[PDB]
Amino acid sequence: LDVPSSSRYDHRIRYVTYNPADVVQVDTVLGVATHIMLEEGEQYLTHAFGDSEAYAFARKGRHIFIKPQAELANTNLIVVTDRRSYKFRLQMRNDRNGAMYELAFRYPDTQARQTREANARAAVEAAFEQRVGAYYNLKYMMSGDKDIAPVNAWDDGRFTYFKFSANADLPSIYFVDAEGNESLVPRTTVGSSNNIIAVHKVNPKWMIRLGNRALAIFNEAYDPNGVPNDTGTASPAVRRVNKGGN
């Protein structure tokens, strides 16, 4: 018998924390409607009264209304849904005092699941932004149409960043292989003012094109090894884990 715990503003609003191995003692008074609230997204499956006639039941989605329709209506309500099955011990109150206007549920496991995920996301963002112990390469040269040149260019061993001035059109950057052929490389545009193009590869030679102008970028300290990606993310402090299982 979990007895609904009354609120601080009114006695008519009582809260109960769910417990699968316990029941709900609902003290209904005569001539009121008790509003039981399910969890959001919970799909009602089936219910079963002790007397189908003692209480009047009408349900709309996750909203439950019951109403006594007889004297000495002491029965039970076992409403079962896809997620769980509720248990009520409907004990009629004879003096019509201390009513129960709505029964609200608290789910401990769901709250723990939601707070664990939020804390994990906070830790993930903190670890992504902390960006500790990275090594930067600044030995980059350029030759070509200098009017489309970046004002800076470097890499951290995983991505290559080209920083452009505020007035310069952002050009298109192409990956150049040993024979001189060019191929697309994926890029993400980062920076406070979107002035940095981050390409997802470290390469010795690059190609920058804007219209009919071309600039060649040369990595003068190419590291054929680099640092391995053991975690699955762009940071050494955030692991990518398999959720789907299956």
Binding site: Y136, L138, Y140, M141, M142, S143, G144, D145, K146, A149, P150, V151, N152, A153, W154, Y161, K163, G191, I196, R209, N212, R213, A214, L215, A216, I217, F218
Partner: peptide, 28 residues
């Protein structure tokens, strides 16, 4: 006889550093 023109190739002469000054995104 006729083939699709290649884009401009940059002149390999004026090779100068991209980084005149250390960026601030490197915290320097």
């Amino acid at each position: 006889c006729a083939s699709a023109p290649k884009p401009k190739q940059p002149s390999d002469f004026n090779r100068e550093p991209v980084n005149k000054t250390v960026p601030v995104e490197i915290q320097r």
